[PDB]
Amino acid sequence: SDPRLIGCLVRAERFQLIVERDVRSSFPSWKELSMPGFIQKQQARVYVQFFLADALILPVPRPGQSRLFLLCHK
Amino acid sequence: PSSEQAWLEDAQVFIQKTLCPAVKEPNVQLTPLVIDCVKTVWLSQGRNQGSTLPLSYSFVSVQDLKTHQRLPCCSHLSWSSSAYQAWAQEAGPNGNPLPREQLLLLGTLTDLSADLEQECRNGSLYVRDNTGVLSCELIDLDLSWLGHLFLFPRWSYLPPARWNSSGEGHLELWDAPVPVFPLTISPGPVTPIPVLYPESASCLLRLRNKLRGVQRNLAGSLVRLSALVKSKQKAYFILSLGRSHPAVTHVSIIVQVPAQLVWHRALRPGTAYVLTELRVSKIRGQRQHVWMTSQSSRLLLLKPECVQEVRYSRLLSYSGAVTGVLNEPAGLYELDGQLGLCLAYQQFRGLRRVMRPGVCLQLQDVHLLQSVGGGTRRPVLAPCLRGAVLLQSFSRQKPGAHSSRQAYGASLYEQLVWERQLGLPLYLWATKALEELACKLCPHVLRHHQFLQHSSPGSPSLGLQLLAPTLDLLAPPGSPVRNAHNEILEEPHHCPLQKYTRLQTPS
Prior knowledge:
Oligomer: part of a larger assembly
Family (chain B): Belongs to the CTC1 family.
Protein name (chain B): CST complex subunit CTC1
Number of strands of chain A: 4
Subcellular location (chain B): Nucleus; Chromosome, Telomere
Organism (chain B): Homo sapiens (Human)
Subunit structure (chain B): Component of the CST complex, composed of TEN1/C17orf106, CTC1/C17orf68 and STN1; in the complex interacts directly with STN1. Interacts with ACD and POT1.
């Protein structure tokens, strides 16, 4: 929730890595699972997940009207 | 030609300006003496091209060189094009000799720093004249040259590269300085004086209660030399004298007064010397007693004409040459292309400026480590504080350019080695992490100089606190404080390099 962490430094030690595979194939039957000539389209997608508490926040040491409202739905 | 007489007149004017002392009455005969000396030196070699004077070389003052010269340059008396080419060939087929200069210098051999004589006397050799003072380094120091003006036949000046280096620079000389005029050497002790051999000194030390206010002279052969220990206002080094072959027995002698610290560059291994009027006072932390030099203590050579009666490291003495520099601030250098040099664990503040690839070195009482792991596998040689580095000559290679861009961050290294006391494999891994992080983040994220800033209170470095989750886990605080006295004296010497353990890569 905190927007203070914008433009800062983060260090983590236990973060999971996830890669998503998308394949568009035209395999005729089960027997042809051996030969590799039946693949047409390929793709990839990578992102990183980790709990913030286990990580460490480190600020970057680079050398008036307001109102209160409560969010209900986005 | 008339140009020669004009040059002589200009040199006379220069002598009148800066080479005429204001202490005594300035009398003109010094200029013909200098002219005769330079003529004799110029004609001694026999390489002259028919010229009785070095018209190519031009006199210059220390202040003039400081104000004008901005790049490293080498100038040596009686040097020709063939001499420079032979010098370049000696520098190596791929070597880059420093540019040749045609100059001449005259100065005073002294260690006095400035108006505050005893508040800045670090013992470094200096060359001083009426225009300024500038340091120097000599291969073999001689006490007969201090305080007297000597003509320098060979010299080289190295200006600072990076503006972070506020130091003025230094001079490096190859040949012995030429005396301008004969000097009246004070005669030594004509009457023969008995000395005490190191075995006799050890026997007297065994007589603990028989050393009450007794002062005598000790003589022996120097075998082991300690480094230059520095502190808040007291600088000292310890010399050991023992009857060589076998030098099993050695004695303790402390040189603490800064006045005679200049002799630290004069002691030589193997050579025997005479030390006179040594006193004994109790030293904390050691039950034994030590013989230390008095105020009026004279150091001479030993000539019988006037003398009467988990793993562990390996220690060895070896001599090699440096090939290339891998990290100036980290103190990691290549030994003959095969081994690694680690000068981090010693105070080398004035050593990094003069050292450069292309110098042969001699090492005594150093620790050899193998199977370090954690990134590198080449064996490393590390000198403990008991031993010291030995200098023999200089190099001829041109300095690099990256040293003035991303090199001056040594304050963090000093804090790590001293204020944090890291082990050698951990130190190397931490260094490598620093270069990797600097490559990954700097300079767009932050400037290199600010990233590697010392960790003063209220402003710590990002890298050290980033590594803290690993450093604290690997090396929790609680290690005993390293003391120079114990490692130098107590037997066996307790140093972090005495015992080592191979470490795996943490992250």
